[PDB]
Write a protein that binds this DNA or RNA. Structure first.
Ligand SMILES: [Ca+2]
Ligand SMILES: [Ca+2]
Ligand code: NA
Ligand code: NA
Ligand code: NA
Lengths: 247, 241
DNA sequence: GCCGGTTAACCGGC
DNA sequence: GCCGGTTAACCGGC
C-alpha cells in the first residue's frame, strides 16, 4: 500500500475534520489529503481514465482505447462501457459514475492501489456495509489467474467514523485494512444485499499467509461454496414459507 | 386511488417544475389534499401524538389496528417505545414516500425519479420479499380492502443549472398482472419496472392478486436458485482443486 | 452477539 | 429488445 506509510498522519489529520450536515463527503477530504501528500500518485477513478485517454489523443474508438489498459483485470475493474469510452473526448470527459469500483486510485511504477472509503455513522446501531460485490470479486480472481496478474494491484479500504455534533458531522476515528490480507474463507457474502461482501474495516482480519494466487483460488472456492449454500437456502426462506398460500 | 382522480392536476403543475442541479409532489398533495396527505414518518408522529395516553411499543403497535399496515408502516420496537412529543420520528428505508389516508383506507405512494436523458434502467420498485410477506399477511388477516401501493414516475433532464421535469406517469401495483412482474434478485430482490410501462389490466379481486403474486414469487425464487449454479458456480469450478 | 434484508436509482452487454 | 449487476451505507429481530 502507498497509503499505509502515511496512515498515521492521515488518521490524525482526519479526526476532528468536519462536514456540514450522509458522511459520504468525508471521502472528498480523504482525497484532498492524498492529493496534497501523494500528489503524483492520486486519482479519482474517472480522473485516471481521463488522464490515460488525454495522453493518447490519436487513440480513438473503444477497442483501441481499451488496449491502453495493458491489463485484462484492470480493464475489468476500472474501464467505463464501450459507448462511454467511444464517446469520450476532451470536451466530453468522464465524470463520477455511481457504480465505479473504486473511490480513489493510487498508482506508482505501474502498481495499482484501489481505495474504497467506508463512511460510518458511529452513533447508530452497527450495520456492516457493502464492501464490494462478491461476484465482481470472483471475476477479478478468475482474471488474475488466467492472466497471471498476481503482483499488479491491491484492493484496500479506509473506514471514516463520524458523529453528528451540532450542525456538523465530525470524524471521530478511522481504520485501514487490505482486502488481500484477509482470510478469504471468512468474508461474509450477503446475497440479498446485491451479493456484496460486508464487513467493518475495523474488524477485518489481516493475517493471511499465502501468495496472491493462493488468495484468489481460495476466495473462489469460498465463493462457489457460498453460492451453492445460498441456492439451497432460498428454497428454505423464499419458497417453503409461502407455499401454504398457493397450494 | 385518491391521487388518480387529480392526476391531470398534478401532471400540469409538475411538468415544468425545476430543481437546482422532486418532493414538489408532496407539496402539491399536501396543499390540495391536506387532510389526507402525510410523509410516512409524519403519519406515525400524527398517530402517536393523537393518542398521548398510549405508551410503549406493544400498545402503540395496537394503534395501527391492522397487522399488515403495522408491517408496512411501523418503525422498530425500540424506536416506537422511545418515541415522544419531544422525540419525533424523522424521514427514513421506509416503505413509502407519501401516505394518503381517508376513511380508514390507505394509499401508499412511492415516487420514482428518472433521468430521461440516459439509457432506460428500470429502478427498484419494492422488495419482492416485502411484497410476499405483505400478501401473506393480507390473506391471513383477510385485509383485502385496506390499502393500495401506487407509483408516480417523474421524468427529468438536465437543462443549464437545473433539472426540469418533462413528464410523469402513474400506476397502481395492484392493477398489474402479478406474473409479469420482473424480480431482480441480485438488486436486493427488488421488483423493477418503469411506471409508464406497468400493465394495468388485472381483472380479479385483491385476494386473487395476492395469491397470484405468491405463486409468481415462489416460482421465481426457484428459478433463481437454479440459475445461481449456472452463473456463480459452474464458471468458477475450473479454478478450484 | 449474531444475522441479513431495504431504500435510492443507476449502465451497458449481446 | 431483452436482460441483470453495483454503488451508498443503513436497522432491528430474537
Ligand atoms: Ca466508498
Ligand atoms: Ca421513491
Ligand atoms: Na465508489
Ligand atoms: Na464498494
Ligand atoms: Na421502494
Amino acid at each position: 500500500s502507498f497509503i499505509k506509510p502515511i496512515y498515521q498522519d492521515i488518521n490524525s489529520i482526519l479526526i476532528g475534520q468536519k462536514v456540514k450536515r450522509a458522511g459520504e463527503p468525508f471521502e472528498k477530504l480523504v482525497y484532498k489529503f492524498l492529493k496534497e501528500n501523494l500528489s503524483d500518485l492520486t486519482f479519482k477513478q474517472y480522473e485516471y481514465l481521463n488522464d490515460l485517454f488525454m495522453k493518447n489523443p490519436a487513440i480513438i474508438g473503444h477497442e483501441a482505447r481499451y488496449k491502453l489498459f495493458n491489463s485484462p483485470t484492470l480493464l475489468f475493474l476500472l474501464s467505463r462501457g464501450k459507448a462511454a469510452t467511444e464517446n469520450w473526448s476532451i470536451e466530453n470527459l468522464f465524470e463520477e459514475k455511481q457504480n465505479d469500483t473504486a473511490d480513489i486510485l493510487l498508482v506508482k511504477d505501474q502498481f495499482y492501489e484501489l481505495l474504497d472509503v467506508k463512511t460510518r455513522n458511529i452513533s447508530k446501531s452497527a450495520f456492516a456495509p457493502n464492501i464490494i460485490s462478491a461476484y465482481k470479486l470472483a471475476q477479478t480472481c478468475a482474471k488474475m489467474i488466467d492472466n497471471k496478474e498476481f503482483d499488479l494491484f491491491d484492493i484496500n479500504y479506509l473506514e471514516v467514523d463520524w458523529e453528528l455534533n451540532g450542525e456538523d458531522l465530525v470524524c471521530v476515528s478511522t481504520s485501514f485494512a487490505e482486502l488481500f490480507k484477509s482470510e478469504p474463507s471468512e468474508l461474509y457474502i450477503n446475497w440479498a444485499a446485491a451479493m456484496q461482501i460486508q464487513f467493518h474495516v475495523r474488524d477485518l482480519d489481516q493475517g493471511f499467509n499465502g501468495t496472491r494466487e493462493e488468495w484468489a483460488k481460495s476466495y473462489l472456492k469460498h465463493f462457489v461454496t457460498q453460492a451453492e449454500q445460498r441456492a439451497i437456502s432460498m428454497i428454505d426462506k423464499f419458497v417453503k414459507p409461502f407455499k401454504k398460500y398457493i397450494l
